Ligand binder design. Structure first.
Ligand SMILES: [Cl-]
Ligand SMILES: [Cl-]
Ligand SMILES: [Cl-]
Ligand SMILES: [Cl-]
Ligand SMILES: [Cl-]
Ligand SMILES: [Cl-]
Ligand SMILES: [Cl-]
Ligand SMILES: [Cl-]
Ligand SMILES: [Cl-]
Ligand SMILES: [Cl-]
Lengths: 257, 254
C-alpha cells in the first residue's frame, strides 16, 4: 500500500422547518439549493436559509455558499431511535434467528403515512432494483406484504380513505392496483392473519408477513421473510416460513409485554 | 460542554434557530437510553430548561417523531427517515455498499465504512454495531486511518483532548505512544488493531480517497481471534481492501 501523505403556541415552527429541510434531501444525489428545498417543502426561502445555517453550525449539514448537503451526523438521529426503542432492540435476535434458519431475509416494519418504514432487518442482502433495502427506508403499503398487514389493522373508514387517495400504480403486471381488489385482498389478510405477496412490488420478489401485537391486541408492526423467485418453491412460503414467523411474533410480543 | 451550553454559544447569531437546535438535542438525549424518558430526565441530560424540552417534545409528537403517555416520551421510527435522507443523497455511501457486500461475501467477515465525527468514527455503511453508531477513533483501525489523515496540528489537538481510556491490556492509551502508532499507519497506508477496543476483536482498515488525494472515509474488515491470524489480515484481507477502495474511488471520481 502507498503511504498516507499530507393557535398552538407550543408548536415550535423552526424545529418543524429544520426537520423538513433534512427530509428535503431524500433521494437527491446532487447537492441542493435553497430554491429547491423551498419548492419541495413550501417553506419560505429565508427560513430555509436559517434552518440550513443552524444545521451547519451543529454539524448536520455543509455548504459551499451556493448549494448544500447533509453530513453523516444525521445518521446519529436515527441511532437515537434504534438505541432507545425496545421493539427495535428486541426484534433483532428474532430476525437473526429466522434468517439463519431459512437462509432468507427477515424484516420488521411499521406504517408511516402511506408507506411501510423498515425498522430492523436480518443480516442478509435484499436488493430492490440492485439497491440494498435498509433500515429507515420506505416502500408503498398497498403492494407489500407488510403493508397489507398494516392496512388490515386499520378500521374500514381509514382504509377507504387511503384507497381513494393513494397512488396505486401498477408496479408489475401482477400488482393489485385498484381499490376494489385491494379492499377484498385486505379483508382476506384480516381473516388469515398473514399475507403473501408474489411479485407485485418487483419481478422476482416474494414475501410473507405477519402482525406483531402489543398486550392490548393492537398491531404494532409487521414481520416478514422475503425471497427471490428461483430461491423458493411455490408453496414454501406458507408451509415453511409461516409457522416460524407466527412463533417469532408471539415470542416477541410476550417478551415485550 | 452540555448541549445547552453549545446552543447558547450562538445567542449572538440572529440566523441561528434556537428551537431547532434544542429539538435536535432532545432527539440526541435518547441515545443508548434503551427505554423512554421524562421531561425532567431529558432536561437533566441536555441542561435545556424543562419548559423548552416540553415544547420541543410536543412539537415532535405533532410531527410524528415522538409519542408520550403524559409521563414518559419515546421516539418514533420516523426519526430513522432523517438518517435515510443522508444515505439516499450521498453517493459515497450508496456506491460503497456493493463493495462491502462483495468483501463480506468473499471473506465471511463484516466489512464497514466510517467517517470521522468529533473524536469518534461514525459508521456510514456496513455489510453483514449499526449504521449511525460511533466508536472512539484512537483504538479502532478506521479511527487510526482517519487520524493519520489529519495534519499534525489537528492530530495533536486530538491527542491532548481525547479521553484515551485503557480498554484492554493492549490499548495504547497515552498521546506519545498513540502518535508513534499513527506515524506507522501513515508510513504503511493501512492499519491493524489487535484487541485494543475489546478482547477477541481484530480489524484491518484502509483509506478511501477522492481523486485529489483527500481521505474521505475508511474501509475495514473486522474479525475475531478464533481463526484469522495477523498474517491473514495483512496478506489476504489487505490486498482485497486496497483493490475495493481503489475501485470505489475510480468509480466515484475517475
Ligand atoms: Cl455542499
Ligand atoms: Cl412486469
Ligand atoms: Cl395473501
Ligand atoms: Cl390495531
Ligand atoms: Cl438552551
Ligand atoms: Cl427560534
Ligand atoms: Cl412513551
Ligand atoms: Cl413512525
Ligand atoms: Cl476496530
Ligand atoms: Cl485483550
Amino acid at each position: 500500500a502507498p503511504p498516507i501523505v499530507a393557535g398552538d403556541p407550543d408548536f415550535m415552527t423552526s424545529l418543524a422547518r429544520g426537520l423538513a429541510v433534512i427530509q428535503a434531501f431524500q433521494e437527491r444525489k446532487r447537492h441542493l439549493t435553497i430554491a429547491q428545498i423551498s419548492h419541495r417543502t413550501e417553506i419560505p426561502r429565508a427560513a430555509v436559509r436559517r434552518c440550513l445555517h443552524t444545521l451547519i453550525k451543529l454539524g448536520y449539514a455543509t455548504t459551499d455558499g451556493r448549494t448544500y448537503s447533509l453530513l453523516p451526523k444525521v445518521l446519529t438521529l436515527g441511532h437515537a431511535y434504534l438505541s432507545s426503542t425496545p421493539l427495535a432492540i428486541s426484534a433483532q435476535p428474532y430476525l437473526d434467528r429466522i434468517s439463519d434458519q431459512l437462509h432468507e431475509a427477515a424484516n420488521m416494519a411499521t406504517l408511516e403515512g402511506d408507506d411501510i418504514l423498515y425498522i430492523a432487518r436480518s443480516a442478509t442482502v435484499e436488493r430492490l432494483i440492485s439497491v440494498d433495502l435498509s433500515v429507515g427506508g420506505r416502500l408503498p403499503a398497498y403492494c407489500t406484504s407488510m403493508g397489507r398487514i398494516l392496512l388490515a389493522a386499520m378500521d374500514d373508514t381509514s382504509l377507504r380513505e387511503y384507497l381513494e387517495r393513494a397512488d396505486l400504480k401498477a408496479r408489475t403486471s401482477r400488482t393489485l392496483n385498484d381499490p376494489e381488489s385491494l379492499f377484498a385482498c385486505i379483508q382476506q389478510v384480516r381473516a388469515q392473519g398473514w399475507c403473501v405477496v408474489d411479485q407485485e412490488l418487483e419481478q422476482g420478489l416474494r414475501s410473507i408477513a405477519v402482525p406483531v401485537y402489543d398486550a392490548s391486541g393492537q398491531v404494532l408492526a409487521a414481520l416478514n421473510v422475503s425471497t427471490h423467485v428461483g430461491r423458493v418453491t411455490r408453496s414454501e412460503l406458507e408451509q415453511r416460513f409461516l409457522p416460524i414467523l407466527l412463533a417469532a411474533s408471539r415470542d416477541l410480543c410476550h417478551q415485550l409485554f
